Amino acid sequence: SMEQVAMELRLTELTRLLRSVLDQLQDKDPARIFAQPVSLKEVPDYLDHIKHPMDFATMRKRLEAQGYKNLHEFEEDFDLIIDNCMKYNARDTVFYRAAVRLRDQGGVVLRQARREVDSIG
């Protein structure tokens, strides 16, 4: 149907906007602390601590399959990256501090992304 095509173009345009948002958020992680999944070979107990691991490569895979239906879903995954790190790692660690900085700087980006998603539709 033509309706299904139009909805698919909307998903595509949302995907385009989320790709730009993702690139901007990942720039706020110049250390690349959040680039890849935590390795279970190197942190064997991780899944005892963290039930829903997340990282920017996993988000990029979901995005490229057009797996985010709305900005809320995308935000949920970004907040898992931050929140998981702030639970597993202590306040005095380079990891935790990296997450706080990503959260604060990412907030700016996400605030305008929300306006753009409402604005364009």
Author numbering: 22 to 142
Q: What wording appears in the published article?
A:
In this work, we show that unencumbered views of the changed, non-ground state can be obtained by recasting the problem as a multi-data set, 3D background-correction problem, which allows the relevant signal to be extracted from conventional single-data set density. Our new method—Pan-Dataset Density Analysis (PanDDA)—comprises: the characterization of a set of related crystallographic data sets of the same crystal form; the identification of (binding) events; and the subtraction of ground state density to reveal clear density for events. Applied to a series of fragment screens, PanDDA yielded markedly more hits than manual inspection of density, far more quickly and all with high confidence, in both known binding sites and new allosteric sites.
An accurate estimate of the background can be obtained by averaging near-convergence density, in real space and after local alignment, from dozens (>30) of independently measured but approximately identical ground-state crystals. In contrast, PanDDA directly eliminates the thousands of strong electron density blobs with no statistical significance, objectively identifying only regions that are unique to each data set; the ground-state data sets are provided by the many hit-free crystals. Using an averaged ground-state map for subtraction, as opposed to a single ground-state map, reduces experimental noise in the ground-state estimate and thereby also in the event map. Furthermore, averaging over multiple data sets minimizes the influence of stochastic variation between the data sets (characterized and discussed in Supplementary Methods). Finally, the averaging generates an estimate of the ground state that can be used directly as density, bypassing the need for any subjective modelling and map interpretation. All crystallographic data used for the PanDDA analysis must also be made available so that the analysis may be reproduced.
